[PDB]
Amino acid sequence: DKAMAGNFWQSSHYLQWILDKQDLLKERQKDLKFLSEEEYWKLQIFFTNVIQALGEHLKLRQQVIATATVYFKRFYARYSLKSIDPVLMAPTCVFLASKVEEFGVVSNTRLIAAATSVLKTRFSYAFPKEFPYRMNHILECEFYLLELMDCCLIVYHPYRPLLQYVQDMGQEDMLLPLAWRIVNDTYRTDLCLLYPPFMIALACLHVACVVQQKDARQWFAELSVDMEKILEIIRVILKLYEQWKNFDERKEMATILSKMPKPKPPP
Amino acid sequence: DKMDYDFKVKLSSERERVEDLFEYEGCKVGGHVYKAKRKDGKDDKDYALKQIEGTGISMSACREIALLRELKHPNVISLQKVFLSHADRKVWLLFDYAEHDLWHIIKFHRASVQLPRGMVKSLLYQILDGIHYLHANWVLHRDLKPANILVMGEGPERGRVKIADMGFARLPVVVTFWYRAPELLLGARHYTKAIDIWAIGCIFAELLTSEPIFHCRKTSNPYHHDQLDRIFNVMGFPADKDWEDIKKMPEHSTLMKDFRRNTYTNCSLIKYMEKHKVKPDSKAFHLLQKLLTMDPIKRITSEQAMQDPYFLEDPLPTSDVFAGCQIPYPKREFL
Numbered sequence: 298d299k300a301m302a303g304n305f306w307q308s309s310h311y312l313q314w315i316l317d318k319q320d321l322l323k324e325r326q327k328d329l330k331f332l333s334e335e336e337y338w339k340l341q342i343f344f345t346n347v348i349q350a351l352g353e354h355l356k357l358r359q360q361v362i363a364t365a366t367v368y369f370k371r372f373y374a375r376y377s378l379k380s381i382d383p384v385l386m387a388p389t390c391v392f393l394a395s396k397v398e399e400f401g402v403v404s405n406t407r408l409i410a411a412a413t414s415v416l417k418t419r420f421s422y423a424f425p426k427e428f429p430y431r432m433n434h435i436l437e438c439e440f441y442l443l444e445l446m447d448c449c450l451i452v453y454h455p456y457r458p459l460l461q462y463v464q465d466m467g468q469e470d471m472l473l474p475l476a477w478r479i480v481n482d483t484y485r486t487d488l489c490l491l492y493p494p495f496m497i498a499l500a501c502l503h504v505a506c507v508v509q510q511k512d513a514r515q516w517f518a519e520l521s522v523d524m525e526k527i528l529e530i531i532r533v534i535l536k537l538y539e540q541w542k543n544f545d546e547r548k549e550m551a552t553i554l555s556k557m558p559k560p561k562p563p564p
Numbered sequence: 565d566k567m568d569y570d571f572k573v574k575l576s577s578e579r580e581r582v583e584d585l586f587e588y589e590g591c592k593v594g595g596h597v598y599k600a601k602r603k604d605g606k607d608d609k610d611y612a613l614k615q616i617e618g619t620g621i622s623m624s625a626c627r628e629i630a631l632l633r634e635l636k637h638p639n640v641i642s643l644q645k646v647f648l649s650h651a652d653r654k655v656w657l658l659f660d661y662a663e664h665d666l667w668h669i670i671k672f673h674r675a676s677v678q679l680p681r682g683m684v685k686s687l688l689y690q691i692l693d694g695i696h697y698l699h700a701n702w703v704l705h706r707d708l709k710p711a712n713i714l715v716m717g718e719g720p721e722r723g724r725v726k727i728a729d730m731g732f733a734r735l736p737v738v739v740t741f742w743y744r745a746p747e748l749l750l751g752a753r754h755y756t757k758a759i760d761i762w763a764i765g766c767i768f769a770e771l772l773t774s775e776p777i778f779h780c781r782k783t784s785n786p787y788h789h790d791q792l793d794r795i796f797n798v799m800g801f802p803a804d805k806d807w808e809d810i811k812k813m814p815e816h817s818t819l820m821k822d823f824r825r826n827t828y829t830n831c832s833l834i835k836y837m838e839k840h841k842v843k844p845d846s847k848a849f850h851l852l853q854k855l856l857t858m859d860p861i862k863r864i865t866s867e868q869a870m871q872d873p874y875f876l877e878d879p880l881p882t883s884d885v886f887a888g889c890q891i892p893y894p895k896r897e898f899l
C-alpha cells in the first residue's frame with residue numbers, strides 16, 4: 298500500500314493546498330487583463346493535454362501524470378503565465394513527479410527528446426517552432442517550482458478512493474472504466490485545488506452511474522457526507538463536457554497562446 | 565534569460581538564505597551536518613543543519629524530503645524548514661538539535677555502570693512508538709541501529725527519543741551487518757516491517773547487556789557467512805518447524821552447503837542472555853525473544869510489542885528517558 302495513504306487529514310495537501318475559490322479567482326485577475334475567462338480555461342485544458350501527452354510518451358503511470366498536473370496548477374494558481382513559460386514548466390512538473398517514487402530519474406536526453414517529439418508530432422497546430430529548452434532550464438525551473446510548493450510533494454488523488462467505492466458497490470467491472478476516465482477529465486478544471494480527492498471520486502462515480510443508467514441512490518444515501526458539495530462538483534463535470542463539445546483546441550489555441558502575457562526582459 | 569525579470573528579482577529579494585539567518589561556521593558535527601543558532605536572536609534554541617550532498621535534487625533526496633515534509637510524531641525527527649540555494653543549487657535541511665544518541669550512550673556504559681533498567685524500558689517504548697507511526701503510514705526505515713536513534717538533551721523535550729537517518733551508506737560501501745535480519749543475509753530482495761522489528765530486537769538486547777548481540781568482525785554482496793554464524797551461535801540453528809519458508813530464501817542451498825545444525829546444538833538465546841545476567845523468566849526476556857524471532861512472519865509487530873506486559877511491570881516507562889536525573893553523557897564534539 299502507498300506511503301502516507303491514510304494521512305490525508307494531516308497532510309500538506311489538505312492543510313496548505315486546498316485553496317479558497319475566491320482567493321484563486323482574485324489572483325487570476327492579473328492574467329485576465331490579457332485573456333478572457335473562456336480563453337483562460339481553454340488554456341488550462343490545453344496544458345492538461347500537453348502534460349498527459351508527455352506522460353504517455355515517457356510511459357509513466359497515471360498517478361504520476363496527475364501529480365505533475367497538480368504541481369503545474371499550483372504554480373499558476375499563485376503566479377501569472379508570464380512568470381515562467383508554461384512550455385518549460387510542463388515537462389519540469391513531469392520530471393519532478395517522476396522522481397517522487399521509485400524508478401523515476403528520467404534521463405536528461407530522454408526528458409528533452411520526449412518534450413521535443415510530443416510538441417512536434419502531437420501539437421504542431423500550436424507550436425510551429427521546435428522545443429527551445431535544454432536541461433539546465435529544466436533544472437532552474439525545478440528550483441522555482443519546489444520553492445513555490447514549499448517542498449510539498451506528496452499529492453493525493455481520487456483514483457484510490459474511487460476504487461474502494463466501486464468495490465464496496467460490487468460493481469467494479471461495470472462502473473470503474475468510465476468513472477476512472479471521468480476522474481482523468483476533472484484535471485481539465487480547477488477541481489483538485491478546491492475539493493478533497495474522495496469527494497471528486499464520489500462525483501465522478503455518480504456521473505458514471507447516471508450515464509450507465511445504474512440506480513445507486515440507496516448506496517449514496519447511506520453515505521455520511523455533505524452531498525451539497527458533491528452536487529457542486531457534479532455541475533462542474535457536466536459543464537466541462539459542454540465546454541469540450543464547443544471548444545476546437547486545434548483551430549483556436551495558436552491564437553490564444555499569442556494573447557498570453559509576455560515575460561519582461563532585463564534592462 | 566527568458567524568465568520574467570520582475571518575478572525573478574522580487575523572489576531573490578524576499579528569499580531566505582541560510583547564511584543570513586544562521587550562524588554555523590566552524591560548528592560542523594558530522595552530506596555535512598552543523599550545529600546552528602539564529603542570528604536574529606528571537607529564540608536561543610539549538611538547531612541542526614544539513615547540506616544535502618551533491619547538487620540539485622536526486623530521486624533519493626526528492627522522495628526523502630517529500631515524506632519528511634508529511635511525517636509528524638514526537639518520536640520521529642521533524643523537518644522544520646528547507647532552504648534552496650539557487651546559486652549553487654544546494655539543499656539545506658533544518659531540524660531541532662539533538663545532543664545525544666544511543667551509539668554514544670551505549671559506548672559510555674560499555675566502557676567500565678550498566679544502563680539503568682527504567683531508561684532501557686523507556687527507550688525501547690519510544691522507539692517502538694516511533695516505528696509504529698512510520699509503519700502505519702507504510703514507511704520503512706531499512707537501517708535501524710543505535711547511531712540512528714537520537715535522544716534530546718536539556719530543553720522542553722528533555723530525554724525524548726527521535727528516530728532519524730544520519731545518512732549512513734546503505735546496501736563497495738562501508739556498513740555494519742550486526743542489526744541485519746537473517747532473511748536479508750539469506751538474500752531477501754524486499755525490505756519489510758519485520759526487518760525493522762528485528763533491528764529493534766537487536767538494539768534492545770544491546771541496551772540490556774551493553775554489547776551488540778550479534779557482533780562480528782566495506783563490502784558489495786548481501787550474503788555473509790560469519791554474520792550468520794554469529795546469529796546461530798546465539799540463537800541456535802533454526803528447525804524446519806520454526807521457519808518453513810527458509811527453503812524459499814535464494815541463498816538457502818548455500819546455507820546447507822556451508823552449515824551443519826549439529827555445530828549449534830548447545831546454543832540458544834536463553835543461554836546467551838543468562839551469561840549476561842538477564843533472567844529467562846523476566847518479562848524483558850520474553851519480549852526480546854518475540855522480537856528476535858528467526859522467521860519474519862512469526863515476529864511480533866510494533867503495536868503488539870507496545871502492548872506487552874513488560875511496559876506495565878514496575879517501573880513504568882517515562883517521557884523523559886533520563887527520569888529527571890542528571891545527564892552524565894558528554895555533548896557532541898565539533899570537527
Ligand SMILES: CNc1nccc(N2CC[C@H](NC(=O)Nc3ccc(CN4CCOCC4)c(C(F)(F)F)c3)C2)n1
Binds near residue numbers: 614640729
Ligand atoms: C547532529 N544533531 C542532530 N539533531 C537532530 C537531527 C539531526 N539530523 C541530522 C540529519 C538527520 N536527518 C534525517 O534523519 N533525515 C531522515 C531521513 C529519512 C528518514 C526516513 N526515511 C525512510 C525512507 O523513506 C524516507 C524517509 C528519517 C526518519 F523518518 F527515519 F526519521 C529521517 C537529522 N542531527
Ligand SMILES: [Cl-]
Binds near residue numbers: 301
Ligand atoms: Cl499518497
Ligand SMILES: [Cl-]
Binds near residue numbers: 340341370373374
Ligand atoms: Cl492554469
